[PDB]
Design a protein around this nucleic acid. Structure first.
Length: 125
RNA sequence: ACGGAAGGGCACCACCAGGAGUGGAGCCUGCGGCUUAAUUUGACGGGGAAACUCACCAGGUCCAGACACAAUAAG
């Protein structure tokens, strides 16, 4: 469905603070295995991943989702890597560069419970 | 200080009178020695002793570096 900027930013900060809570699965494989075991409480998929194959497989389970499968889209790959600790680590004075991720799962919420509840309930519409 | 000048004790780790002996024998056990891949080692070691005790040998295994720092990395 139609993705807004508030939704995507609140989402990347959800990945940011639920990353600290030791509750993420950062990668295509770890997130697909996260969704096969019923461990994904919310999944984040990047809207700019070049190869569409694995996505054409995840977009078949996105258009027809299960009762325990909520998803949501972000804007870029390198940045969704960044908020998951990967991609980049940029704070007021410090910087460190890695490479960006395609999809990331939130297994344990913790410090972002009401935020992932809001994000998942506004994607219900 | 030192005496190997002399004088006393005062003693079965000294001598008399003995007693039992040991040293000779086989076996035990400790020390040295040689031999050994090692025959662990101190000068009784609570040192009793096939694993343990092993501290010595022939080989087969693990587990290494706090960290800092440069690349990689999430496709």
């Amino acid at each position: 469905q139609t993705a807004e900027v508030t939704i995507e930013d609140a989402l990347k900060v959800v990945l940011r603070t639920a990353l600290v809570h030791d509750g993420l699965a950062r990668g295509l494989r770890e997130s697909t295995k996260a969704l096969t075991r019923g461990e994904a409480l919310l999944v984040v998929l990047v809207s700019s991943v070049t190869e569409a194959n694995i996505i054409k497989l995840v977009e078949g389970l996105a258009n027809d989702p299960e009762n325990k499968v909520p998803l949501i889209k972000v804007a870029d790959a390198k940045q969704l890597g960044e908020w998951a600790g990967l991609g980049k680590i940029d704070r007021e004075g410090n910087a460190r560069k890695v490479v960006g991720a395609s999809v990331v799962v939130v297994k344990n919420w913790g410090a972002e419970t009401d935020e992932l509840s809001m994000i998942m309930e506004h994607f219900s519409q």
